Amino acid sequence: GSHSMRYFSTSVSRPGRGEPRFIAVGYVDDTQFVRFDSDAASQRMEPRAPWIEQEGPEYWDEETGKVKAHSQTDRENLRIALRYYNQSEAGSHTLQMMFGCDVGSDGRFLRGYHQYAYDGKDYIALKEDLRSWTAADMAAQITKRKWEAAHVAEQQRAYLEGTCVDGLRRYLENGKETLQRTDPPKTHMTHHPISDHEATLRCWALGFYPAEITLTWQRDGEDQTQDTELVETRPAGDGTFQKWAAVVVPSGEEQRYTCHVQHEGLPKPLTLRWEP
């Protein structure tokens, strides 16, 4: 199965109350391992996973440098988008970036990502082929023409296929104990009468990693995607995840409904029936 590295950056302007806040964060799969916060006392790239502290002081020096550079650049990119879009200097604005690579079971590079969003909308992105750009609008066309001319795609493709996969592969080795582990979900059901006619059946899955999971309700063995409430997978705070799925069951038909849990950590899908 795939593994993946992602770095997510957020730059937020705040005219009058300083210069842009910049927060960057690195993940291997669903495990945070580094951070940088322009408002952090340290002003370094800090570790957030046990297995990264394994890296020498040459790693922490080179990584702090690269992310401070990112910081200063996306600071100027907030100024440029402001001009391109003809916006007042009064308003606060957001510039987010995401980059990283996926590798297969074998450490083989699978795909790479380089994307920007301005004020919550796509701005510019490297396409799947790592050769071309998608510009969301006319402002991004300008950036696209600039980057086409300066051969920025080739430069990024180099990093995505090289340094990015090299790092991910090193992390998957040094963090093997943690990253190649598979914590199966601990399951249970609850019953909540809503009316005189109906009740809620809620299917719980707790303490699982990775976050990828499927909770499905079946009625008489047929899938009940209509009238299933599914909450966003949420972090427990300990590096595992929690999720539930619910149906409003016609009261006195609880036995007709079964919950199905699928997870990388389970040899077979689990089935749960309501038991009073």
């Binding site: 770095y7 690195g26 990584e63 550079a69 100027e76 950036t143 300066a150 990093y159």
Partner: peptide, 9 residues
């Protein structure tokens, strides 16, 4: 590993 270079818009 973070990438090395970042471009202006």
């Amino acid at each position: 590993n973070y990438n090395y270079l970042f471009r202006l818009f």
